[PDB]
Design an enzyme around this catalytic site. Structure first.
Site, PDB file in Angstrom:
ATOM      1  N   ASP A 138      -5.313   3.223  13.930  1.00  0.00           N
ATOM      2  CA  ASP A 138      -4.243   3.751  12.978  1.00  0.00           C
ATOM      3  C   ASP A 138      -4.956   4.859  12.444  1.00  0.00           C
ATOM      4  O   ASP A 138      -5.976   5.619  13.011  1.00  0.00           O
ATOM      5  CB  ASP A 138      -4.065   2.639  11.904  1.00  0.00           C
ATOM      6  CG  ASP A 138      -5.025   2.504  10.645  1.00  0.00           C
ATOM      7  OD1 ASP A 138      -5.991   2.952  10.715  1.00  0.00           O
ATOM      8  OD2 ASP A 138      -4.664   1.949   9.865  1.00  0.00           O
ATOM      9  N   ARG A 164       0.971  -1.248   0.011  1.00  0.00           N
ATOM     10  CA  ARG A 164       0.215   0.071   0.073  1.00  0.00           C
ATOM     11  C   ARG A 164       0.809   1.342   0.240  1.00  0.00           C
ATOM     12  O   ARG A 164       1.435   1.518   1.056  1.00  0.00           O
ATOM     13  CB  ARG A 164      -1.142  -0.071   1.129  1.00  0.00           C
ATOM     14  CG  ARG A 164      -1.931   1.094   1.236  1.00  0.00           C
ATOM     15  CD  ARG A 164      -3.046   0.969   1.904  1.00  0.00           C
ATOM     16  NE  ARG A 164      -2.992   0.979   3.414  1.00  0.00           N
ATOM     17  CZ  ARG A 164      -3.848   0.921   4.362  1.00  0.00           C
ATOM     18  NH1 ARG A 164      -5.292   1.119   3.930  1.00  0.00           N
ATOM     19  NH2 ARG A 164      -3.723   1.306   5.803  1.00  0.00           N
ATOM     20  N   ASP A 169     -11.983   5.070   6.964  1.00  0.00           N
ATOM     21  CA  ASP A 169     -11.472   6.672   6.313  1.00  0.00           C
ATOM     22  C   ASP A 169     -12.741   6.984   5.822  1.00  0.00           C
ATOM     23  O   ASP A 169     -13.103   8.234   5.634  1.00  0.00           O
ATOM     24  CB  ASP A 169     -10.470   6.436   5.099  1.00  0.00           C
ATOM     25  CG  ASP A 169      -9.138   6.613   5.540  1.00  0.00           C
ATOM     26  OD1 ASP A 169      -8.283   6.065   5.214  1.00  0.00           O
ATOM     27  OD2 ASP A 169      -8.944   7.684   6.244  1.00  0.00           O
ATOM     28  N   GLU A 173     -12.925   4.646  -0.104  1.00  0.00           N
ATOM     29  CA  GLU A 173     -12.841   5.001   1.147  1.00  0.00           C
ATOM     30  C   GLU A 173     -12.921   6.674   1.176  1.00  0.00           C
ATOM     31  O   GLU A 173     -12.333   7.334   2.119  1.00  0.00           O
ATOM     32  CB  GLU A 173     -11.577   4.614   1.926  1.00  0.00           C
ATOM     33  CG  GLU A 173     -10.386   5.156   1.283  1.00  0.00           C
ATOM     34  CD  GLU A 173      -9.022   4.700   2.068  1.00  0.00           C
ATOM     35  OE1 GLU A 173      -7.865   4.720   1.327  1.00  0.00           O
ATOM     36  OE2 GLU A 173      -9.423   3.783   3.145  1.00  0.00           O
TER      37      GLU A 173
HETATM   38  C1  LIG Z   1      -3.917  -2.377  10.792  1.00  0.00           C
HETATM   39  C2  LIG Z   1      -5.131  -1.484  10.500  1.00  0.00           C
HETATM   40  C3  LIG Z   1      -5.722  -1.071  11.873  1.00  0.00           C
HETATM   41  C4  LIG Z   1      -6.933  -0.575  11.539  1.00  0.00           C
HETATM   42  C5  LIG Z   1      -7.303   0.280  10.491  1.00  0.00           C
HETATM   43  F1  LIG Z   1      -8.353   0.875  10.228  1.00  0.00           F
HETATM   44  C6  LIG Z   1      -6.506  -0.081   9.107  1.00  0.00           C
HETATM   45  C7  LIG Z   1      -6.882   0.468   7.900  1.00  0.00           C
HETATM   46  O1  LIG Z   1      -6.098   1.066   7.205  1.00  0.00           O
HETATM   47  C8  LIG Z   1      -8.325   0.562   7.450  1.00  0.00           C
HETATM   48  C9  LIG Z   1      -8.762   1.322   6.384  1.00  0.00           C
HETATM   49  O2  LIG Z   1      -7.749   1.683   5.375  1.00  0.00           O
HETATM   50  C10 LIG Z   1      -9.652   2.034   6.288  1.00  0.00           C
HETATM   51  O3  LIG Z   1     -11.039   1.366   6.793  1.00  0.00           O
HETATM   52  O4  LIG Z   1     -10.158   3.258   6.168  1.00  0.00           O
HETATM   53  C11 LIG Z   1      -5.532  -0.997   9.465  1.00  0.00           C
HETATM   54 CL1  LIG Z   1      -4.638  -1.337   7.902  1.00  0.00          CL
HETATM   55 MG   LIG Z   2      -8.126   3.587   4.831  1.00  0.00          MG
END
Ligand SMILES: Cc1ccc(F)c(C(=O)CC(=O)C(=O)O)c1Cl
Ligand SMILES: [Mg+2]
Ligand SMILES: [Mg+2]
Ligand SMILES: [Mg+2]
Length: 708
Positions: free
Chosen positions: A614, A324, A443, A415
């Protein structure tokens, strides 16, 4: 300065060296050609990249103004159409993306996402293609710790018995015997290329003999039995002398599941990288992964089997890797131009992660993509012009790297609102590159709040998960993918399970995703990948998808349904809980981001549930409070008091870490505490509610102070 001049660019020496000494060797790309390429691509594409950010800003300004006078959906929809936010739906089409691996086109299963900057975690993720089902059941709450079956310092046989019976039941459901239950098996043999399971009174074969995929050891007493169901492998390990085998009726030691089919090595929302030194740590891990020599311990070898008919064969011991990249917004002083302007980080990521991924196309002293593709997830795009830009970026990078056009495949995060409502046109813009669409729902919630910031007070963060807009967004995403011919061609994916310790709930709940026709969905750990794999044996995703073909289940009006709270929705205690909960999650995440460069952390919420945080979860928490403050739900003193109340709790949670600096009692001397406060009090001013500008600025501030 410690910088290298190439054309109009001044490259951080640490990056320049990494590339020349580690990345380029083995590619047959002339370093001079490479670096001239970078220069040319940055110069050529930067203006459009900037024009695309200006567009976001112009559209958001018009939406803010619209709400400020003074909700009629016809009028709103016509308005979005006028300003060029909501675009015409293109004609039906099928994607043409070719040269994609089976893990993507055909196999439905869990998709693991991990911070590339943590070598240990990334190694575990790559190796998570295979995982012990016994370990995942024994070690988590899927087997409840009721009286007698609790975890102790040593092995609880009563618990192990519960684990064993769970797995027997899983076997009966996934690979049924013609007669009887795996629960009664006394042994296994291979006779005339078919699996024979011994029962106490008789012997039996599989109801469907084609589910037998191979074995190890002698046919007459195999050390393991490999089976397959919905394209996923299951391996029964047989060892009557093992701790568990000794207690088992058939000498079974474990059941191994093919778990994390694909993994996303993440440079974006799960890592903190604000300069060249950080980026190189990441690039170097991604390099070790593609050359197969990353060690922190090591990457697993492929697994050897004997086919039922007789021949020897091999299955991949590693998950198929995506990377990513970061999205179109941020810059990074890893490279600056002659004026001292920072270069776009997304453009850099394409060049450098793309260069590095070439190593994963060749054998290591083993091959990531056997079909010759590089798989890049591009996050946070807003609408089809931004998708076309990424396509053009990949095209120019391919030219610089001397790769065939369309080697660089794109995983599209859905997103951002302007992608959601123009989703068909986004897929079309990348019709010959797309390998997945995926609902990054966290997001997307952030964007939902920010886009309609001026409309009114939003519902509580927890309430968002069940709002009309989001349910329609999920269905619409699947509809769009299927209608563009994704079935058999590309992944339709859904989002992350964040409650890392609530595995019983995940197993009960997350089954909804493949039931919705998602061929994959995000998990935060190898353990959770093994457990989520169970869902793919229960649900035939291929058949679900064919059953959904040609359905249109969400309307544009549903998609545009702004999650505004109704009049008098909350009591004072409910508002206090939401504020405390948001401040604690924010503080918990930010303190490790700013003080330690850790982009992903388990932070327990107000109810003591551990959440994997995150940047996206941060975007929601900060945007929601900013919205409540903007509309007078809460005061600035409420925000402050809450930050000050939760800070010591967060300090306590981190009380071990040698590198931890308490925030309390001298809050305003903490750069992390002030970052937290700024994310909220300035949230409404951040571009599309993004958290990076502030995190980066403050993380850089902290590093600079630590150097004095
Ligand atoms: C490891 C991890 C933990 C929580 C998260 F929300 C994510 C995402 O990065 C989510 C995501 O892109 C989205 O829902 O917007 C990650 Cl990798
Ligand atoms: Mg995201
Ligand atoms: Mg079936
Ligand atoms: Mg603004």
């Amino acid at each position: 300065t410690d910088r290298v001049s190439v054309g109009n660019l001044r490259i951080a020496r640490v990056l320049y060296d990494f590339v020349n000494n580690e990345a380029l060797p083995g590619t047959d790309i002339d370093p001079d050609s490479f670096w001239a390429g970078v220069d040319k691509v940055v110069a050529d594409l930067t203006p459009q990249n900037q024009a695309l950010l200006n567009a976001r800003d112009e559209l958001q300004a018009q939406i803010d103004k619209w709400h400020r006078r003074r909700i009629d959906m016809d009028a709103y929809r016509q308005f979005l159409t006028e300003i060029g936010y909501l675009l015409p739906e293109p004609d039906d089409f099928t994607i043409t993306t070719s040269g994609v691996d089976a893990e993507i086109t055909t196999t439905a299963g869990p998709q693991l996402v991990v911070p590339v900057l943590n070598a240990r975690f990334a190694l575990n993720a790559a190796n998570a293609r295979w995982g012990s089902l016994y370990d995942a059941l024994y070690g988590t709450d899927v087997i409840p710790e009721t009286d007698g079956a609790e975890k102790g310092p040593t092995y609880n046989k009563v618990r192990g018995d519960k684990v064993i019976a769970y797995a027997r039941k899983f076997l009966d459901d996934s690979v049924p015997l013609s007669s009887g239950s795996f629960g009664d098996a006394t042994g296994f043999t291979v006779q005339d290329g078919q699996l024979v399971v011994a029962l106490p009174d008789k012997s039996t074969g599989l109801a469907n003999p084609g589910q037998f995929a191979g074995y190890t050891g002698a046919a007459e007493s195999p050390t393991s039995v490999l089976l397959i169901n919905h394209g996923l492998h299951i391996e029964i390990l047989i060892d009557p002398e093992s701790q568990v085998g000794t207690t088992d009726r058939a000498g079974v030691k474990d059941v191994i599941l093919e778990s994390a089919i694909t993994t996303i090595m993440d440079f974006e929302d799960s890592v903190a990288a604000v300069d060249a030194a950080d980026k190189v740590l990441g690039y170097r891990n991604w390099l070790g992964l593609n050359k197969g020599d990353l060690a922190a311990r090591v990457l697993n070898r492929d697994r050897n089997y004997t086919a039922p008919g007789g021949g020897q064969f091999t299955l991949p011991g590693r998950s198929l890797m995506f990377v990513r990249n970061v999205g179109h917004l941020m810059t990074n002083d890893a490279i600056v131009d002659t004026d001292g302007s920072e270069v776009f980080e997304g453009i850099m990521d394409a060049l450098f992660t793309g260069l590095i991924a070439i190593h994963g196309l060749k054998a290591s002293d083993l091959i990531n993509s056997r079909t010759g593709s590089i798989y890049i997830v591009k996050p946070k795009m807003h609408g089809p012009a931004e998708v076309a830009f990424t396509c053009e970026l990949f095209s120019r990078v391919e030219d610089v790297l001397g790769l065939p056009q369309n080697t660089m495949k794109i995983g599209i995060m859905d997103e951002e609102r302007r992608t959601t409502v123009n989703l068909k046109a986004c897929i079309k813009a990348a019709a010959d590159r797309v390998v997945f669409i995926n609902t990054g729902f966290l997001d997307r919630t952030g964007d939902e709040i920010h886009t309609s910031m001026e409309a009114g007070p939003m519902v509580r963060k927890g309430t968002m998960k069940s709002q009309p807009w989001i349910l329609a967004y999920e269905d619409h995403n699947v509809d769009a993918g299927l209608a563009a011919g994704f079935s058999g061609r590309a992944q339709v994916g859904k989002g992350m399970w964040t409650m890392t310790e609530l595995m019983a709930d995940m197993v009960e709940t997350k089954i909804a995703q493949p039931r919705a026709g998602a061929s994959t969905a995000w998990v935060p750990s190898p353990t959770a990948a093994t457990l989520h794999a169970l869902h793919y044996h229960q649900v035939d995703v291929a058949a679900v998808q064919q059953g959904l073909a040609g359905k249109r289940r969400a309307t544009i009006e549903q998609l545009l349904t702004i999650p505004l709270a109704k009049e008098l929705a909350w009591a004072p205690d409910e508002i206090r809980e939401e504020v405390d909960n948001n401040c604690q999650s924010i503080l918990g995440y930010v303190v490790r981001w700013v003080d330690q460069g850790v982009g992903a952390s388990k932070v327990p919420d107000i109810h003591d549930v551990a959440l994997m945080e995150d940047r996206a979860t941060l975007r929601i928490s900060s945007q929601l409070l900013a919205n409540w403050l903007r509309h007078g739900v809460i005061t600035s003193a409420d925000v402050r008091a809450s930050l000050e109340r939760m800070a010591p709790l967060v300090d306590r949670q981190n009380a071990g870490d040698v590198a931890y600096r308490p925030m309390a009692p001298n809050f305003d001397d903490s750069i992390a505490f002030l970052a937290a406060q700024e994310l909220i009090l300035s949230g409404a001013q951040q571009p599309n509610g993004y958290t990076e500008p502030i995190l980066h600025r403050r993380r850089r501030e902290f590093k600079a102070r630590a150097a004095e």
